[model samples]
Target: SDVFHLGLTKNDLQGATLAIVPGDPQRVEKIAKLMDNPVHLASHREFTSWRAELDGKAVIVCSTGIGGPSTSIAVEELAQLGVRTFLRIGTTGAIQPHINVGDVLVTTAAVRLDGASLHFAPMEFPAVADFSCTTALVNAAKSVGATTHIGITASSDTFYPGQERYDTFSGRVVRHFKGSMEEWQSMGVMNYEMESATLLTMCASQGLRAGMVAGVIVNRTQQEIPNEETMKATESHAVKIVVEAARHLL
Candidate 1:
């Protein structure tokens, strides 16, 4: 059968048993640089993929656009290409005041606040990270010297409304904006992102390994954003953690 959607086949990801799913298409190259003898693979729509060797193991980095639908497609396609381990390297806004910009939120479980994951499984079902990959990330973060938090993250479909980010048009739609945030805070949710719930749920159901290491670029509780240099620095730190952690798992 001919390859569709991703414009790639099993041959493209040959020997690349591990894959990193980042959110931005352009950022795939940033991850490829971490690998040895890295090479560009293909660019199809929101999906941009690459191949490289990290710590002597072949790897791939592909983008999953913004939300769960795109992420779901990317995960399924990557699975078809023989990628068994999926680690998401993405950016998020911190919900707690203590989690400053330039910190890493290593997701152990995700709250399926979004509807996409429900399509895959029931709403009562849990979205959890793979044990091995989660451990690898924790170990790798320490080795790379990153400030990391192993906690729960809430993945929403819409950033502004679904995540309860206040805009001029807030209460007219979703009534419990501030209330929802407070509830999550009491429950110890760490940060807010667009994809982790889908990643964990899909991987779990499919019997594949999946985990997330996200950079805290925006602090929603404090309403703060670090300067560009610090943002890039912290983001790079998170990526390095994932890259090195893959070495351990491989």
Candidate 2:
């Protein structure tokens, strides 16, 4: 209500129905470049924004920076500016062994291990993607000939200790806490990240449509890290799919 402090005026975001939110500012630019014609609207802190047209549809890309705190602020302000659909396009780590590093994981739901969503809703509230958005993502992935895995994503506040790993100066204890992954998998969780839970939960609660597409950077189950080439390829492929999906939704 107080102009969001992000310096984004409503006029700057009007008519943009589909928004692609990424964690990195560079990824925001990358997504904007993929559009037919893009216009920079604003930039403050990690919240860089650009409006563009894709297949005759209006869309916008904004960076939410890293972690849930920044992501929640971005989503709230963007929604206030009339963005109805949200697609989180970024990179994530995979908990499933078979998922390759370069493959895209389309999140249908997210494990609310992050703190931002807790302020908005009870932990029992589900952080699930809209049905239409999910379908569009699936179709878009197929059209682009990219490998995709659709499942629940685990969202954690602490990237290390909270995710079942610890950091120490002395002898390091690499404890594999498969509990979160196993529980989600048993209940059907797909990947792990930082922001999806807050995004999805807020979208659902606020009657906004939301979905997520992430490139796999690391595979926890297999204990593998993707090479630089693989990481770039994955990010490009994921962005393409999300862009296509957003256009289709429009």
Candidate 3:
């Protein structure tokens, strides 16, 4: 079937098996340009797509918008178009005190704290990244010279209360997540992001590969927010690591 939600089809994939997914629609083109000759493919709802080449093989760079619902849809559609692997490259907030802003986080697994993943797998099922993909990312980070945190990530549906953040529109966090940040840190969870659990769970259940590389834009422990230039630099570093790994896979 031709993909509907992503506004893509098998023809657009060019027999590519890898798709690099980012959460912002605007990031798609930036990601693709880092590969080879980039071409804008489609834009529908929260999905924006581009086609590029890595090691002479076609690769997809697509955006999944903000959270699990849209992220799940992007994975589903790309899989239908013959993508067997996915790497979610995005920004995150560190839950641990030692994780500095601008540090790169390679999610080995995720705490399935989001609603979309539940619909894909049972609560007992774990949300883990593909082993080889995870390994490649670790090596890629070294190759790209990035300071990387390789560990568990907590994925949530809401950016504020779900992550136990106080500075939000609600002005307060929910009781269920009142101590989540500290708890996640205590458990060695690396950071908090909006999409990786859904991507990992869905891809694993389907026997496909998935991994995540996130740039730490905010460090919850230090309450440090990077300047715009710093955030952009970190994100570009993350994007390159994902590309490096994807190139290796190709």
Best by lDDT: 3
TM-score of 2: 0.90
lDDT of 3 by residue, 25-59 (tens): 89888999998878899989789989999888999
The TM-score of predicted model 3 comes to 0.95
Which digits, one per residue and each the tens of the lDDT, describe model 2 over residues 1-250? 3247457776676578778998888888879888978888788888888888887777889988877888888888888777889999988777777677878888888888787878778988998899899989989888899888988888876676446555433433345444565676666667778898889998999999999898887776785556856678878888899998998899
TM-score of 1: 0.94
lDDT of each: 0.85, 0.81, 0.87
Number of clashing residue pairs, candidate 2: 2
Question: Which 10-residue window of candidate 3 scores lowest in summed lDDT?
Answer: 220-229
lDDT of 1 by residue, 1-250 (tens): 2356687777677688899999888889989887887888888889898898876778999988888989988898888888999999977778888787888889989989887888777877889899999999989888987788889998888777778766746444366445678688778999888798998999988899999998888787785557856677777888898998888888
Per-model TM values vs. the true structure: 0.94, 0.90, 0.95
For model 2 the local lDDT of residue 231 reads: 77
Task: Give the winner by lDDT: 1 or 2.
Answer: 1
Error of 2 at 101 (Å): 1.2
Query: Which residue pairs show collisions in model 1?
Result: none
Order candidates by TM-score, high to low. 3, 1, 2
Error of 1 at 54 (Å): 1.7
